Amino acid sequence: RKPPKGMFLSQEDVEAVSANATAATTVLRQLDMELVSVKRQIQNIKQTNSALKEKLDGGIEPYRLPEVIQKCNARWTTEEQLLAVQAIRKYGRDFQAISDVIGNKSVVQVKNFFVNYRRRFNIDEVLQEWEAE
Amino acid sequence: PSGVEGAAFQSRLPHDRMTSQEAACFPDIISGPQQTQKVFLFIRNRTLQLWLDNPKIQLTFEATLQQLEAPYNSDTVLVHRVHSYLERHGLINFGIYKRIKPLPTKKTGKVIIIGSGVSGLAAARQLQSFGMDVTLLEARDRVGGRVATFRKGNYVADLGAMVVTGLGGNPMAVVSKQVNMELAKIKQKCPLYEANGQAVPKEKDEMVEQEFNRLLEATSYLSHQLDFNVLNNKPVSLGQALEVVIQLQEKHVKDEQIEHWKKIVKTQEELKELLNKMVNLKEKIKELHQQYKEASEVKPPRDITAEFLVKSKHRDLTALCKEYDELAETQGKLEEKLQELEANPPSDVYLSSRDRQILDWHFANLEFANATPLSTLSLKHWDQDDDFEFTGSHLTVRNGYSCVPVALAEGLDIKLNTAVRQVRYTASGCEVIAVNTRSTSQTFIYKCDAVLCTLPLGVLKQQPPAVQFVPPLPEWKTSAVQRMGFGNLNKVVLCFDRVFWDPSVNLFGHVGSTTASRGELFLFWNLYKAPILLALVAGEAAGIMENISDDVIVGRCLAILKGIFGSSAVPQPKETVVSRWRADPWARGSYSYVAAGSSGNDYDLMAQPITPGPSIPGAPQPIPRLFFAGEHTIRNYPATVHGALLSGLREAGRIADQFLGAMYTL
Numbered sequence: 119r120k121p122p123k124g125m126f127l128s129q130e131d132v133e134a135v136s137a138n139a140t141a142a143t144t145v146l147r148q149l150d151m152e153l154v155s156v157k158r159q160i161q162n163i164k165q166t167n168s169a170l171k172e173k174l175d176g177g178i179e180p181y182r183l184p185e186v187i188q189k190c191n192a193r194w195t196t197e198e199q200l201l202a203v204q205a206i207r208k209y210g211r212d213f214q215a216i217s218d219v220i221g222n223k224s225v226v227q228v229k230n231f232f233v234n235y236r237r238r239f240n241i242d243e244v245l246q247e248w249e250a251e
Numbered sequence: 252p253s254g255v256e257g258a259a260f261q262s263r264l265p266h267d268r269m270t271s272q273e274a275a276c277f278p279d280i281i282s283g284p285q286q287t288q289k290v291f292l293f294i295r296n297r298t299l300q301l302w303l304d305n306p307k308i309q310l311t312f313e314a315t316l317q318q319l320e321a322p323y324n325s326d327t328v329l330v331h332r333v334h335s336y337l338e339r340h341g342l343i344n345f346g347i348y349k350r351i352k353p354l355p356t357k358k359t360g361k362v363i364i365i366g367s368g369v370s371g372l373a374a375a376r377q378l379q380s381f382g383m384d385v386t387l388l389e390a391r392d393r394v395g396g397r398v399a400t401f402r403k404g405n406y407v408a409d410l411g412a413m414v415v416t417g418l419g420g421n422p423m424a425v426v427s428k429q430v431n432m433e434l435a436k437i438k439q440k441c442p443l444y445e446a447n448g449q450a451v452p453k454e455k456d457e458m459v460e461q462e463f464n465r466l467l468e469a470t471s472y473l474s475h476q477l478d479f480n481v482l483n484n485k486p487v488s489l490g491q492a493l494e495v496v497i498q499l500q501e502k503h504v505k506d507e508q509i510e511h512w513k514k515i516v517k518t519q520e521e522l523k524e525l526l527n528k529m530v531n532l533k534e535k536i537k538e539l540h541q542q543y544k545e546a547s548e549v550k551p552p553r554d555i556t557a558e559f560l561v562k563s564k565h566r567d568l569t570a571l572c573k574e575y576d577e578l579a580e581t582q583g584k585l586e587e588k589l590q591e592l593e594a595n596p597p598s599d600v601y602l603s604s605r606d607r608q609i610l611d612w613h614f615a616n617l618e619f620a621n622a623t624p625l626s627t628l629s630l631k632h633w634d635q636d637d638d639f640e641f642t643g644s645h646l647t648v649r650n651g652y653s654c655v656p657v658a659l660a661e662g663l664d665i666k667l668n669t670a671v672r673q674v675r676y677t678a679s680g681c682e683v684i685a686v687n688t689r690s691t692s693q694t695f696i697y698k699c700d701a702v703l704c705t706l707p708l709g710v711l712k713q714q715p716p717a718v719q720f721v722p723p724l725p726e727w728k729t730s731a732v733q734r735m736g737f738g739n740l741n742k743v744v745l746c747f748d749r750v751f752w753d754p755s756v757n758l759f760g761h762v763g764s765t766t767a768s769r770g771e772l773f774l775f776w777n778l779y780k781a782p783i784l785l786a787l788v789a790g791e792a793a794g795i796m797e798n799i800s801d802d803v804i805v806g807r808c809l810a811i812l813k814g815i816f817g818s819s820a821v822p823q824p825k826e827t828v829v830s831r832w833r834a835d836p837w838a839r840g841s842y843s844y845v846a847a848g849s850s851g852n853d854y855d856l857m858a859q860p861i862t863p864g865p866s867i868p869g870a871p872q873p874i875p876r877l878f879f880a881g882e883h884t885i886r887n888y889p890a891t892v893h894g895a896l897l898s899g900l901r902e903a904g905r906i907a908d909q910f911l912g913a914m915y916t917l
């Protein structure tokens with residue numbers, strides 16, 4: 119039913135190695151090369167990836183920024199409303215970013231604001247102006 | 252199996268069923284009902300056991316009935332029939348026994364037997380046991396044919412046959428008791444010595460052999476499941492199919508590598524894509540740090556939009572650093588997931604040049620098992636008889652097989668140095684022409700009623716032929732003589748003055764240099780009492796070595812041995828011989844194998860006798876006048892001593908039934 123375990127024979131491959139006298143060694147050279155040609159290929163992209171990696175030496179440690187420990191206040195200062203509006207204009211709806219920016223207002227206080235003040239900060243204009251970009 | 256049932260099995264018959272040649276003979280019982288069958292079986296089995304349980308004395312009809320009970324001993328015309336049958340087809344009272352009732356004064360009907368090898372003789376016994384006038388014709392100065400045993404001093408070894416292939420089933424088991432051949436076992440364990448002269452480590456010996464086995468098993472699958480049996484008109488040899496399986500093995504070894512690397516790349520190259528992505532981010536990040544830095548240098552106080560600019564760029568920055576961290580992330584994963592794949596390669600080779608050369612010894616074994624180049628064995632039917640295999644340890648005839656031919660030989664009219672030239676068979680009888688091998692211008696005619704021919708395959712094949720038949724042989728038959736494999740095997744006998752080998756070791760093998768010579772001296776036999784070694788010329792090698800002189804052969808013989816044991820643990824040999832079978836004009840080969848595009852059937856065909864044409868035309872269908880046995884006629888046990896013996900039993904049944912009638916079928 120099945121060939122000795124680990125021995126390999128498919129009907130397909132059998133007819134292959136018997137199509138002539140040296141269809142035999144044909145298929146075996148053909149692969150010997152086909153392999154060489156994948157070894158050479160492998161060097162190349164190792165090399166390529168090597169330099170490509172050097173260029174990253176340093177990581178981003180020059181560019182990291184200190185942490186921001188601080189407490190989500192409930193009141194908006196006029197100062198605060200103001201960064202808001204601009205955050206909206208710059209960002210649209212990414213309520214997350216907009217919260218990062220203002221610094222001390224939670225991702226929701228943000229959305230609420232979007233409505234109490236929608237009133238008077240013409241949040242519609244602001245928002246459509248954003249889309250137009 | 253034992254008791255009554257043992258004796259069936261030991262006799263090569265199913266203990267609870269009726270053989271076909273039984274039915275041929277007891278049509279009444281077999282067409283009969285169950286009850287009668289079971290009786291008949293039992294009668295046969297027991298009688299068998301009887302002749303078994305002691306084979307040095309004729310077992311008579313009486314003696315038999317004697318030991319039976321009712322129900323069974325009741326019908327005395329079964330019993331007499333049953334006993335009569337066996338007795339007829341040497342199933343009991345074969346070989347060397349003592350007759351209770353000396354031989355019937357006068358004889359019915361003459362037979363010439365051609366050639367006094369086992370078959371030949373084991374037949375002539377039966378025939379003259381059945382009191383016919385029997386005479387063997389034999390070209391040699393000696394009996395045995397391909398049972399030669401060599402005798403000088405206390406040096407004693409077999410050029411010809413040598414193993415007794417188990418006893419459980421074996422006619423030879425019986426003949427061992429009848430005659431004093433001294434049987435020593437054979438110890439499986441064979442160690443190996445690479446061309447250099449060194450042990451193959453337990454490591455390899457195992458691996459390579461285990462591969463070998465896996466390999467054949469594979470050729471089998473090939474033939475049965477994928478039906479790989481013709482290749483552009485020629486029929487696949489075992490060779491061929493082995494190559495094919497090795498190739499495909501090499502093949503899949505490559506495919507493995509290829510697809511391994513092809514999965515390193517696909518991952519290396521998924522890395523490229525990630526580095527670029529990552530470099531071009533160190534970009535925006537650097538550049539954006541700048542922007543933020545600048546924006547923060549603008550000291551307070553500020554208007555809100557400039558404040559925002561800081562905060563914005565702050566966000567846009569951390570938000571961007573997230574990314575390069577979560578991409579640094581992904582980078583680690585893929586960097587390890589890659590020593591990983593470089594750590595566990597596939598094997599770089601299927602078979603080393605050391606290996607693939609040992610494996611070449613295992614082939615040379617097989618080549619010897621079959622007295623032939625696996626290039627010649629039929630793929631389908633090479634192990635056709637792999638079920639009719641005896642049981643228990645193979646053995647050796649420590650005093651030299653010839654002892655058996657010479658046992659049978661005895662009290663038997665045998666003309667030696669008589670070479671049969673023509674065999675003429677007509678409707679009114681055969682005449683056989685022979686010469687004296689010594690002075691060959693000196694000629695003999697023998698008249699007889701039948702002619703039983705043991706001429707080994709080889710001679711039959713000889714072309715022009717040595718023996719002429721008159722009239723020519725039915726093509727159905729000559730065709731089968733062609734179709735069929737006559738192989739070859741030779742021996743080297745090394746006679747020393749001291750046991751320099753490990754003596755608790757019966758055989759050890761030398762691994763040869765090439766493929767083209769794996770045969771050449773590839774195996775050595777320590778079997779005997781004296782200090783004597785057996786050297787085997789197997790496979791393709793044998794045919795060629797027949798052309799090298801003796802000296803040279805003993806040359807490479809010493810050579811190899813030294814190499815294994817020390818360049819001066821190895822004396823010169825006192826006595827030596829070399830077998831040149833294929834050259835032997837009365838053997839032209841060692842012994843049949845199933846060629847490619849032959850089969851079992853062809854053996855059957857060899858066994859079939861020849862019935863001449865009618866003298867005067869439209870006179871009635873004649874009697875068969877010309878019969879065949881020899882190791883090549885026995886489809887089920889070919890090319891062995893048992894086989895030849897069995898062969899010549901069978902033909903003697905058949906000729907007796909013929910010329911003396913089978914009064915036991917009524």
Ligand SMILES: [C]C1=C([C])[C]=C2C(=[C]1)N([C][C]([O])[C]([O])[C]([O])[C]OP([O])(=O)OP([O])(=O)O[C][C]1O[C](N3[C]=NC4=C3N=[C]N=C4[N])[C]([O])[C]1[O])C1=NC(=O)[N]C(=O)C1=N2C(=O)[C][C]C1=[C][C]=C([N]C(=O)C2=[C][C]=[C][C]=[C]2)[C]=[C]1
Pocket residue numbers: 365366367368369370371388389390391394395396397398410411412413414415416620636637638639640641669670671672705706707710717718740741742832836837838840841842880881882883889890891892893894895
């Ligand atoms: C050669 C050889 C060797 C080297 C080895 C061996 C052998 C061989 N074998 C075999 C035997 O030998 C045989 O078979 C026999 O012997 C045969 O016999 P026959 O048939 O009878 O015949 P012969 O013998 O030949 O005789 C013949 C005769 O004839 C005459 N002639 C001829 N011509 C003529 C004449 N005459 C007149 N005129 C004319 N022209 C001659 O001369 C002669 O006489 C063997 N066997 C056995 O048994 N054993 C052994 O061991 C052997 N060997 C070896 O070694 C091996 C083999 C084998 C093994 C194994 C087998 N199988 C088995 O077993 C099996 C398989 C499968 C499964 C299971 C098992 C086989 C084989």
